[PDB]
């Protein structure tokens, strides 16, 4: 099952073979072995193909690299010619526009109904949207590229028959596709010419005289690539179309000033990048890489100017000039081409934009493509600075180790009582005895002479090898390395030239874990503590190239299975015990903080910062520096040789990259046991590897920063998020220091702290770059957020431009695609301040995805029609339009709820869906459809998913494919699970036990499904359900041989019939509904009552007569009502008659505002808004089960059956042991005062106070987003509740009649189950 999006790096080594089978020439690979190797059984029969022979009968023998041609194809290809796809994508374009315009509707109708709307209304709104959509630059190109993607996926599917060949002829270009390979035939007149007369692309393969007689009387030339550059080009076209459409649409909301850059500057940037690439090949990405730092530089200069504020821009300009001049001297550019090539960075430098527009422009970096990777350059990059001699100072290592031990001691003192009973000689610490005897811990100021004494402190094993309660860490479907005995079996046995003597069997983690005869944690401890990773057969460590990136090449390492288990164990132990004395992320904006709290921990307060790159540390770590820390980590546990596996085993390995189509150079059968080293192999790796031992390295970095803070008496805070580390210095000033000298002093303090840290880190063997480390005062960019003097900057193009009709959602499921689009829409609307661009994009893509899946489904046969085989008549526009309006909870396909524009977390997904459906049906004159559209027919669901889906309905159309995958995994486990520990957990009567437990959990009166769901996860059945879920993609269902050895029936037919049944469930209407529920739902006119009746009628077999409580909640849109008062007015509601309400008022102080105060989104204000593994789960289970039921004497007769399966301690000993967020930027929330105490008796109650504040703030932000701040004519707002959906909640407890009457004492095995 080929995928529709890029998921692998781009390598073109095998394309050398293809050109040899067709009598052409192309030097993609740097390995000479591929020049004269035997050809495989396939890609050799091309000599007997008539289509390929006819296609290449009028072209030169020489070819050209695809690096220089992709920009030419991106502009020379449009949909005009003939394509072999009969249902063409552009045919269904009017319906897409109609649906998009229909969503520019009710969204607006819903918004007006709520009370937000907009003061400024323009009549010409649909016409502008229609013109913006119609007049897009990348529309027909996008449709043509989607036809190409469909056709090439269909071709890749077979790749063994006569149906694997396709041909397209479009104006100037010809394309021939054959089984993962593409031939492009293009005119020679489109290629830029070198000053010697030959094209720029041909100057690296042929000499000038050679590439002048090969062409001669030829006008067309051929390039060869894989069927993965096509997918990349399709992704680029989709992203460009999305960003252009969003930028154009945003100009209608706010004509005066929008937050998106423009739709004309971005086009020029695209053209300039394309020209630069067409001239420089894949080498031109080194200039494209500079867009992000230049954007950051331009953002930094949008504030008060300081002498060192412009240093970042100057350094980046110098760097880009040097890079441009170094990669151009060899190439013989024309004098005219040397002027046009300096237009990308020249345009970037001369920009004049607001900080918000620059922040949005930051997000277009992958819109030009990705380079072609080689296994030689990638390994030469990491070899050059991993076998390098280093010079170190022992003294700084000494203080670093002392600070390490100090931090550990302080963390153990702060919690768990005081001190840790040092079992060491008291002579060797003359000065720490006083603090120990009086039980006191020394503060920082006087710890400068007793630091060395911390070296002499000893203790027992403070931590333990326990608290591991997640078995999914040992089964994750990752990649491992083969054993040393058979290491060259990962190469194709024709490029190698010999058959490898030994062949492996399996290479997947889940299959090897399910075959592990003797598992358990103590076995891993015994394996590591005996130095069994040094065995001769456990030393491979292969490499693998990274995914989509703009680097020359990056790699990640793979180890054999037991060593991978040891690494996972070490990371798990170190994450819990240590790595807590060293807080990783402490991201904070001191601008929006209150006084008397920052100053208290800072001993006016001004803070500066600087950011360093923590990735380059990995290769600079040596054993001579990290030995003491590793030994101390060993001592703090009971282990002996566990934490030093990497430094012991990595240097003894043979470094190589496991690429299928090119092995290491000069590899034969004779020199197989002791292979030589060359341009892609080496032996003495002395540094670290990415990902391995990350927590220890972060702890060492934190210790170094703390040492610098001790030496230099400044308050320092360190935060780590990703590959960057931010260090913030707090200055503290004696007041009466103006406001300009204070910032200069803060910057000077930050600079001196940076210098001291650089000195210390260099003395430890790790080098920082003074020309790449830079000091910021107010602008802080970190992790997922950027701030400019306390004002948050928008970033919505990151997720909005990734919307596409095709994704990887298990057998091309429509529901998964629509859910992904909805999630992207929510995440995009969370940022920024505009609304309509993202929703218009999502509405455009939803219908198009529906049509693609209806007509071109890869899982079925060619020419199939999903909409015809189910209804029997063509699927019209009305049926699809009505199907997408019903929310998914009730069995529809609607994933874009307008109510998500206010808050992201929803109290009740049923009442909100009912309200949305009622509003949509009220907009149109189709009111008499509400009843025969939500009744439906209840399905056949047992009491196993009611626990898993507490707030839901028993409809068959609202489910997903999780249960199918769970059944597949369960049967695969049943057939082959010789793990000897999974078998104990998955016994013969596991299903019956789980069903009985779930049935008993819902036997109370009244029934509370939330409590049952909460408590079910701590049972062994919950652990079984957690383990069962590890499948994620639609390729393990087919490629995994162990799954497909169950015989029975093929999974393809079952998937097809499930898809047909699901497609028949939707779009049918009035065919899967009953009449008893419809008659019982009449004359209700209340959403809460309707939801309660719907929940009661469903699950009727589960809930015979017992009422259900704790599920239904009201919809806040129907609960409150805004009034929008002005200064000289009085509320009409308050004058009449108890009228509880919530008050919202607007402040006046601005504090900071960038660039102006015209928009309320650009400004801010004052604002303000060791226990074992199973012991825990036992304790919380007992606590909650005791808390829920209190008015009974059975609280002791129900704890025992659940507790006896988790912990050895009996009852009466455990007894002794016993966020909703919002989708708006946090800028207006600092300028509003929300008062809820005016409600009086609070109408406990049926109101969630966590969401009322969000609703009020979001309403105010949406109402005034495109209006001037001085034009706002409203002062305060009243939210008056209506007495129609508000009720009181009396206190009520749970009464249990019987007991489980089930034996769970058989679970006396280790891991995620009962421990002694």
């Amino acid at each position: 099952y080929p995928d529709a999006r890029l998921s692998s790096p781009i390598v073109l080594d095998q394309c050398d073979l293809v050109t040899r089978a067709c009598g052409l020439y192309s030097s993609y690979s740097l390995n000479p072995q591929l020049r004269n190797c035997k050809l495989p059984k396939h890609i050799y029969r091309l000599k007997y193909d008539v289509t390929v022979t006819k296609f290449l009968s009028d072209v030169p023998v020489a070819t050209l690299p695809i690096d220089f041609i992709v920009p030419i194809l991106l502009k020379a290809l449009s949909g005009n010619g003939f394509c072999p796809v009969e249902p063409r994508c552009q045919q269904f374009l009017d319906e897409i526009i109609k649906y998009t315009m229909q969503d520019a509707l009710f969204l607006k109708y819903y918004l007006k109904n709520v009370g937000a709307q907009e003061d400024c209304v323009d009549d010409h709104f649909q016409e502008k949207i229609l013109s913006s959509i119609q007049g897009n630059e990348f529309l027909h190109q996008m449709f043509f590229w989607y036809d190409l993607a469909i056709l090439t996926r269909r071709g890749r599917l077979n790749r063994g028959n006569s149906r694997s060949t396709w041909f397209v002829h479009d104006d100037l270009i010809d394309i021939l596709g054959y089984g993962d390979y593409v031939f492009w035939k293009i005119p020679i007149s489109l290629l830029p010419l070198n000053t010697q007369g030959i094209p720029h692309a041909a100057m690296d393969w042929y000499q000038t005289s050679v590439f002048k007689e090969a062409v001669q009387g030829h006008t067309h030339i051929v390039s060869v690539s894989t069927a993965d550059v096509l997918i990349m080009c399709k992704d680029l076209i989709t992203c460009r179309f999305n960003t252009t459409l969003i930028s154009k649409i945003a100009e209608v909301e706010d004509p005066v000033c929008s937050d998106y850059p423009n739709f004309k500057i971005v086009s020029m940037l695209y053209q300039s990048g394309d020209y630069l690439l067409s001239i420089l090949g894949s080498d031109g990405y080194k200039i494209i890489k500079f867009l992000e730092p230049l954007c950051l530089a331009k953002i930094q200069l949008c504030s008060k100017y300081t002498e060192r504020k412009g240093r970042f821009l100057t350094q980046m300009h110098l760097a880009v000039n040097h890079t441009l001049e170094e990669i151009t001297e060899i190439r013989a550019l024309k004098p005219s081409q040397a002027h046009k090539i300096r237009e990308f960075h020249r345009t970037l430098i001369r920009l004049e934009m607001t900080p918000q527009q620059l922040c949005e422009l930051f997000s277009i970096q992958k819109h030009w493509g990705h380079p072609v990777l080689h296994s030689e350059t990638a390994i030469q990059k990491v070899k050059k600075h991993a076998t390098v001699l280093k010079a170190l100072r022992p003294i700084v290592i000494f203080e670093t180790y002392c600070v390490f031990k100090y931090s550990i001691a302080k963390h153990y003192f702060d919690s768990q009582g005081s001190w840790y009973s040092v079992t060491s000689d008291r002579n060797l610490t003359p000065g720490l005895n006083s603090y120990i005897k009086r039980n006191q811990f020394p503060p920082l100021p006087m710890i400068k002479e007793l630091l060395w004494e911390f070296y002499h402190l000893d203790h027992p094993p403070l931590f333990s090898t326990k608290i591991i309660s997640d078995l999914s860490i040992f089964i994750k479907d990752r990649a491992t390395a083969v054993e040393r005995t058979c290491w060259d079996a990962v190469f194709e046995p024709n490029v190698l030239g010999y058959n490898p003597p030994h062949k492996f069997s399996t290479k997947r983690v889940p299959e090897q874990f399910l075959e592990q005869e003797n598992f358990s944690i103590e076995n891993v401890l015994s394996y590591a503590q005996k130095l069994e990773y040094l065995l001769p057969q456990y030393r491979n460590f292969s490499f693998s190239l990274k995914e989509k990136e703009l680097n020359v090449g990056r790699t990640f390492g793979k180890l054999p299975y037991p060593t991978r288990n040891v690494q996972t164990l070490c990371e798990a132990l170190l994450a819990d015990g240590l790595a807590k004395a060293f807080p990783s992320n402490m991201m904070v904006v001191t601008e929006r903080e209150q006084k008397e709290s920052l100053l208290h921990q800072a001993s006016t307060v001004r803070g500066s910062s600087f950011v360093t790159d923590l990735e380059k540390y990995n290769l600079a770590f040596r054993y001579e520096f990290t030995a003491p820390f590793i030994e101390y980590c060993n001592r703090c546990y009971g282990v002996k040789n566990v934490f030093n596996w990497m430094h012991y085993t990595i240097p003894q390995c043979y470094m190589h990259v496991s690429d299928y189509y090119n092995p290491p150079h000069n590899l034969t059968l004779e020199n197989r046991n002791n292979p030589p080293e060359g341009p892609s192999s080496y032996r003495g790796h002395m540094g670290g590897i990415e990902g391995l031992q990350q927590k220890l390295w972060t702890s060492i970095s934190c210790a170094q920063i703390s040492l610098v803070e001790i030496k230099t008496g400044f308050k320092l805070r360190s935060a780590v998020m990703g590959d960057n580390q931010c260090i913030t210095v707090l200055s503290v000033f004696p007041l009466e220091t103006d406001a300009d000298e204070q910032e200069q002093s803060a910057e000077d303090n930050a600079a001196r702290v940076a210098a001291s840290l650089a000195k210390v880190t260099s003395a430890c063997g790790i080098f920082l770059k003074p020309d790449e480390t830079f000091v910021h005062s107010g602008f802080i960019y970190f992790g997922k957020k950027q701030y400019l003097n306390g004002v948050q900057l928008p970033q919505s193009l990151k997720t909005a431009t990734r919307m596409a009709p095709l994704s990887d959602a298990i057998f091309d499921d429509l529901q998964g695609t629509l859910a992904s689009i909805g999630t992207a829409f929510e995440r995009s609307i969370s940022e920024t301040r505009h609304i309509f661009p993202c929703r218009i994009t999502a509405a455009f893509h939803t219908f198009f995805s529906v049509r693609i899946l209806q007509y071109h489904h890869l899982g079925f046969n060619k020419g199939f029609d999903l909409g015809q085989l189910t209804l029997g008549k063509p699927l019209d526009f009305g049926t699809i339009s009505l199907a997408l309006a019903v929310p998914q909870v009730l069995g529809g396909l609607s994933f874009l709820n307008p109510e998500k524009c206010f808050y992201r977390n929803l109290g009740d997904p049923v009442t909100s869906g009912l309200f949305q459906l009622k509003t949509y049906l009220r907009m149109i004159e189709m009111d008499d459809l509400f009843l025969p559209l939500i009744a439906k027919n209840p399905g056949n669901c047992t009491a196993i998913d009611f626990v898993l889906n507490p707030s839901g309905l028993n409809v068959p159309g609202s489910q997903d494919l999780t249960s199918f995958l769970r059944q597949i995994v369960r049967r695969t486990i049943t057939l082959s699970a010789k793990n000897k520990l999974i078998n104990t957990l998955f016994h013969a009567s596991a299903d019956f036990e789980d069903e009985m437990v779930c049935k008993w959990l819902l036997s109370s009166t009244p029934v509370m499904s939330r409590f049952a769901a909460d408590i079910f996860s701590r049972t062994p059945s919950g652990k079984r359900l957690q383990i069962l879920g590890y499948l994620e993609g639609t390729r393990t269902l087919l490629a995994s041989k162990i799954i497909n050895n169950n015989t029975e029936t093929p999974v393809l037919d079952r998937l097809r019939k499930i898809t047909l049944q699901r497609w028949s469930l939707w779009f049918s209407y009035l065919d899967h509904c009953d009449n008893i529920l419809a008659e019982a739902l009449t004359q209700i006119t209340c959403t809460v009552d309707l939801a309660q009746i719907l929940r009661e009628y469903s699950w009727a077999h589960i809930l015979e007569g017992r009422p259900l409580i704790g599920a239904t909640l009201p919809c806040m849109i129907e609960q409150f009502k805004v009034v929008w008062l002005k200064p000289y007015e009085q509320c009409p509601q308050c004058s009449n008659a108890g009228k509880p309400f919530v008050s919202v008022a607007v402040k006046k102080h601005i504090v900071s505002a960038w660039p102006n105060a015209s928009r309320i989104s650009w400004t801010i204000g004052d604002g303000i808004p060791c226990p074992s593994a199973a012991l825990r789960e036992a304790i919380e289970l007992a606590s909650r089960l005791t808390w829920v039921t209190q008015g009974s004497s059975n609280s002791d007769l129900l704890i025992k059956p659940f507790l006896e399966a988790r912990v050895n301690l009996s009852v009466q000993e455990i007894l002794q042991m016993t966020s909703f967020m919002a989708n708006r930027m946090s800028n207006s929330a600092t300028r509003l005062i929300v008062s809820t105490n005016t409600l009086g008796e609070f109408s406990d109650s049926n109101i969630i106070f966590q969401n009322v504040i969000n609703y009020a703030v979001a309403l105010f932000d949406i109402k005034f987003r495109n209006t001037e701040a001085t034009d706002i004519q409203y002062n305060r707002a009243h939210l008056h509740l209506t007495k129609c959906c508000t009720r009181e909640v009396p206190a009520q407890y749970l009464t249990y009649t019987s007991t489980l009457d089930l034996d769970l004492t058989r679970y006396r095995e280790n891991e995620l189950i009962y421990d002694n």
């Binding site: 060395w452 001579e624 600079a751 210098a755």
Partner: protein, 260 residues
């Protein structure tokens, strides 16, 4: 008789008692001498705490030093002998004194290995770092000219000649930093690059009362096309800050001046 014997016995008892008293006095003298002789020992404990602290410091430091290196570290004689076999630093960590290796680096007489000298140079290049000049860029004439070209639109304009003249004069007077700082300050306010160059010419004291340079050309073809529209007759007393950027001297004696 009996009384005389009693008297004699009493006298003997008195003499023996006196001898015992003398012995007791000697005992008291010896005891007080021993008690007074212990004064130096009492103050000995004062000078031992400092020794204990210093010894504990040295023990901690050298224990960490010996533990951080391997079981095979090689001695000074071993590494000196091994240096005679190629560069080839010996296996295992070697220990050097900063002054000794620093002094040996310049004294290139006994074939110090290249890797060792690169490592020492990288280690020592970070010592000369202060609060100032931490990340201060270095600007030369060519780099400044390249930066200045990136702002002016088009090509062949007289502003390019002005930029070249400014860079040459700054290189001659060694004032590139001041010129660059003035240019950046002018650009920050939002002025056009041409205005920034004009302000640089009119503000920097070096360019004040400076004779414009003279460039020799064979004919009108040397000058760019964009510069062709800014030709004037040469004034008797041209000034660089008044508008004249350069004077073109032809082979036949014709003199032309370029003005913005």
């Amino acid at each position: 008789h009996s009384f005389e014997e009693v008297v004699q016995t009493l006298a003997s008892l008195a003499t023996v008692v006196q001898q015992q008293t003398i012995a007791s006095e000697s005992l008291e003298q010896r005891i007080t001498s021993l008690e007074n002789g212990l004064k130096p020992v009492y103050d000995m404990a004062k000078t031992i705490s400092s020794l204990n602290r210093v010894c504990a410091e040295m023990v901690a430091k050298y224990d960490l030093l010996v533990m951080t290196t391997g079981r095979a570290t090689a001695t000074a004689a071993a590494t000196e002998a091994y240096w005679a076999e190629h560069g080839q630093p010996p296996p295992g960590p070697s220990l050097y004194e900063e002054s000794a290796i620093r002094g040996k680096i310049e004294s290139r007489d006994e074939t110090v290995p290249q890797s060792v000298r690169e490592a020492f140079n990288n280690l020592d290049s970070t010592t000369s770092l202060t609060e100032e000049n931490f990340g201060k860029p270095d600007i030369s004439a060519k780099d400044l000219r390249n930066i200045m070209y990136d702002h002016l639109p088009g090509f062949g304009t007289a502003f390019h000649q002005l930029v070249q003249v400014i860079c040459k004069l700054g290189k001659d007077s060694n004032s590139l930093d001041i010129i660059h700082a003035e240019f950046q300050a002018s650009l920050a306010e939002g002025d056009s690059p041409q205005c920034a160059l004009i302000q640089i010419t009119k503000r920097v004291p070096i360019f004040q009362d400076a004779a414009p340079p003279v460039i020799h050309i064979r004919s009108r073809g040397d000058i760019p096309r964009a510069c062709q529209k800014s030709l004037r007759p040469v004034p008797p007393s041209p000034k660089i800050d008044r508008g004249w950027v350069c004077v073109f001297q032809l082979q036949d004696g014709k003199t032309l001046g370029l003005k913005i």
